[PDB]
Design a protein around this ligand. Structure first.
Ligand SMILES: NS(=O)(=O)c1cc2c(cc1Cl)N[C@H]([C@H]1C[C@H]3C=C[C@@H]1C3)NS2(=O)=O
Ligand SMILES: NS(=O)(=O)c1cc2c(cc1Cl)N[C@H]([C@H]1C[C@H]3C=C[C@@H]1C3)NS2(=O)=O
Ligand SMILES: NS(=O)(=O)c1cc2c(cc1Cl)N[C@H]([C@H]1C[C@H]3C=C[C@@H]1C3)NS2(=O)=O
Ligand SMILES: NS(=O)(=O)c1cc2c(cc1Cl)N[C@H]([C@H]1C[C@H]3C=C[C@@H]1C3)NS2(=O)=O
Ligand SMILES: N[C@@H](CCC(=O)O)C(=O)O
Ligand SMILES: N[C@@H](CCC(=O)O)C(=O)O
Ligand SMILES: N[C@@H](CCC(=O)O)C(=O)O
Ligand SMILES: N[C@@H](CCC(=O)O)C(=O)O
Lengths: 270, 260, 260, 270
């Protein structure tokens, strides 16, 4: 019996092939996550068919209803059996599903439009309004926001640190709304905001976008915390230990580093 | 009922209190792992007695005996209940004990006594003039042992067939040896350990290049134990809250006894 | 009894003189191959009639049909007696035809339009901005297909899985494309051919990096023939006497129609 | 029936290891040729026993006796059946044995003591007295000679080039004798001659000596000839074609380049 692997349409984890109007099956998508699924199936024998969640959300908890949605939400309800997707490992998700050991290090970073080149002897220097989260919280002339129903929204929602509390208090009463449904929408907002917008996203997508054309955006500051990407699995499933072992095996041989280099730096430019 | 805890004497993870002859119990130990164990006990609600394994090795498998030494051995043979210590998560140990979610990211890093013609691992393997070594019975010598890369295989062959034995019993002795070797030694060790060593006086050692790979530190637990899930939840909540980052800064960058 | 000699129209190995329409016989052909064949005919003592293959292919195996094309095909199938031409010695040809000792060393070279940003082959493979290709139905392509190195395999996938077809029927058209690509095309070809192209006007191409591997040009003879040993002896005598070096200098650097 | 492998004790092809007094069998010798023979026997299955010729000569034909000595000499008479050694391919040699395709590229180079660095603005440069062989022929104050009963001496004997004829004319009447018995003897004469002597040898050993400590010698000029090292085999033997195919395979997979790099450049003491 074949199992369904749920994934989110995000780059460079899963991208649409140029020739995909006629292709069918698992050959429709390319990226990091499809390679990870291929290696998982090579380490342990099973037939997998990738799918994309209709909602398109990573997964969070709704208010006053306590119903899980998104990738995690449909993984709890049994319509999916494994989520090989860039899903962060969180305490709220750890109490409802089983998470394998992280296969990708990440952190909340700062995304800003690349500032222009200051002419002043003829050397070329780079300056940026934002160099840390503290100064972004202090300043107000540049707006900032996160991705709706993601992991960073939950991180700022339940943070007792003073600076993160200030950022969250600014975010909840932001007029107009600052959150974005997709990473691409937030990136486009940074692109067309004339430097009047800061994006809070995971470091992996941030560096991939920085090293991709037209590369007019760059990351400043530092990682606000340390988290990881894990392979989801429903509670009481016979796949958690094999997938955990497979991730450990891939880490030991170094396949994960090879895929990261191939899909992050090998296709870079500028 | 009390809980038996096993750890190792490694800095800045577990150290000995300056005034420890006049103190008894758990008050004579301080460091990252001691505070971590205190918070884990607070979140779970159990009394724990911190102990140090009589053998000062982390744990491995000896030559053709199928016996676990170090902390993992005390964990599998009923001598221990939980090990909050710098125990790297690897495949081989995942089949004998339970690993919680990692609480400290790390990677294999090089360090030399202060042009730097040691830029990364490629030329270091290609340069046999200066020797190098790893910790015996740890997670690094085994990492080199079962690596399928050609460069890492060459490094393993050069490490095993070297006169004299470049392996060192304890990382402190290896640090001393590389400090007294006048640049004729590069020590392979974890990123956190190397950063802590290079961040203290006399600051005559530096980390160069980047990590050879990425790994983490896990709170080990005997297989099929009722404490694995509670400690995993405790690590998750401490990482979400940010206390782990606070302890990392407190025991790595707070004393600041050097200029960098 | 005359001897059929096969070859290809490749510069500077074979030239069609300058007024070939006014000449007939083997007197209308000049170049390294023509003079070399003259010397072999003088040493062995046989009359030969130089011919050009109908389809100017060096030799390859087609799509799972077990058919030899080009000069090697004309040799195995009885259409030719001996090949004096730039025929690289490789594994597959040795099993179907007899090779003499190499009379010209060679290697895989990188050619670009006029510090190079690529130089080494690994650097060229890592950068996908500049496309590259090989000569179809030759030895370079086959060398790339059977290469087991990761870099060379990724190269082979790069030229094979590219849009449009980077492969070119003749090395002359590839050289023209490189000169017309404004530095966006690197052509992979033999060191001798690349050096000859560079040495000629308008001197808008240069050779960067080293030679990827070790090959040579052999004089092809069909399997189990009586002319393999005499031709090998003639090649050895010419190499010892130094006529090969003089011919290479005369047809590669004697003209010197460039500033260097 | 095990096949006897005849070789010559020359570096870096065959060198004695530090722990060789107690070792026995093929493990006594380590170097380029020994692992080349190992790969040859791995490609085509046979059992090989390593041996070293008692005479220690590469091989040549004496005058008025028509008796072949050295490695080729003992190979012709039948006491050996294959030779994985740095043996050059020559017309006189191939007339009696069946060589294989050249597994190494070689030429005749010039060996000279490395001159001192010239003081004069503070840039440090180096100069050589005689770069090309022509200058060595015109010059007389620095002596030069080949290796006795080798390929270089044979080539100079039968050379028709004017400069090479002049060099041979000088060598044949050298007082005292200029030819050296072993490559090590020629190198030592170069070191102890204070720059008064020049050595003629194949480029491979010249490169090895240049890149080996204390690296007081260097090679000037280009490559006078262009020859190669082939695997010897008695005329009419059945091992010729398997050896040729194995050499071609090793060249094609890149093994030969790996051995050259790991026995010539990898131990870069200088
Ligand atoms: N270089 S990277 O961010 O793609 C990356 C990140 C990580 C990797 C492997 C790679 Cl390649 N493995 C580790 C895993 C290995 C074992 C120890 C920690 C987890 C379990 N997690 S990680 O530290 O999140
Ligand atoms: N900054 S650090 O090295 O002290 C550090 C490193 C890490 C932390 C927390 C901290 Cl504070 N948590 C993560 C864990 C949290 C959840 C997401 C990945 C694992 C499960 N592992 S980690 O990426 O190895
Ligand atoms: N200088 S060159 O490229 O024209 C050149 C190259 C070579 C020549 C002769 C010349 Cl002139 N002969 C050798 C052959 C001669 C004998 C020794 C090696 C083979 C058999 N092959 S080679 O090393 O490929
Ligand atoms: N890199 S090198 O000079 O040691 C070198 C040089 C050469 C090698 C192998 C090596 Cl390792 N093999 C080739 C051989 C392969 C086939 C084609 C030419 C001969 C037969 N000759 S070569 O071009 O003279
Ligand atoms: N990848 C994150 C959400 C994306 C983001 O943080 O921008 C998650 O798994 O929740
Ligand atoms: N964290 C390692 C330490 C040993 C090493 O650094 O090699 C272990 O537990 O084995
Ligand atoms: N002349 C080569 C082919 C040309 C090329 O590969 O560029 C041969 O003998 O096969
Ligand atoms: N190797 C040469 C002899 C000269 C030398 O080794 O320097 C030969 O095969 O004859």
């Amino acid at each position: 019996k074949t199992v369904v692997v749920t994934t989110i349409l995000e780059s460079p984890y899963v991208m649409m092939k140029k020739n995909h109007e006629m292709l069918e099956g698992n050959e429709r998508y390319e990226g990091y996550c499809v390679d990870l699924a291929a290696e998982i199936a090579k380490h342990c024998g099973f037939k997998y068919k990738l799918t994309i969640v209709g909602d398109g959300k990573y997964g969070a908890r709704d208010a006053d209803t306590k119903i899980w949605n998104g990738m995690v939400g449909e993984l709890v309800y049994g319509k999916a059996d494994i989520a090989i997707a860039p899903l962060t490992i969180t305490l709220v998700r750890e109490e409802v599903i089983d998470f394998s050991k992280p296969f990708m290090s990440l952190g909340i970073s700062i995304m800003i439009k690349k500032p222009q080149k200051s002419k002043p002897l003829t050397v070329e220097r780079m300056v940026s309004p934002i160099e840390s989260a503290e100064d972004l919280s202090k300043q107000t002339e540049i707006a900032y926001g996160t991705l709706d129903s993601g992991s960073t929204k939950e991180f700022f929602r339940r943070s007792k640190i003073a600076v993160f509390d200030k950022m969250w208090t600014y975010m909840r009463s932001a007029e107009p709304s600052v959150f974005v449904r997709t990473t691409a929408e937030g990136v486009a907002r940074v692109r067309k905001s004339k430097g009047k917008y800061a994006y809070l996203l995971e470091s992996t997508m941030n560096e991939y976008i920085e090293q991709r054309k037209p590369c007019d955006t760059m990351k400043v500051g530092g990682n606000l915390d340390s988290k990881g990407y894990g392979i989801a699995t429903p509670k009481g499933s016979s796949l958690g230990t094999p997938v955990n072992l497979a991730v450990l095996k891939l880490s030991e041989q170094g396949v994960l580093d090879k895929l990261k280099n191939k899909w992050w730096y090998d296709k870079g430019e500028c």
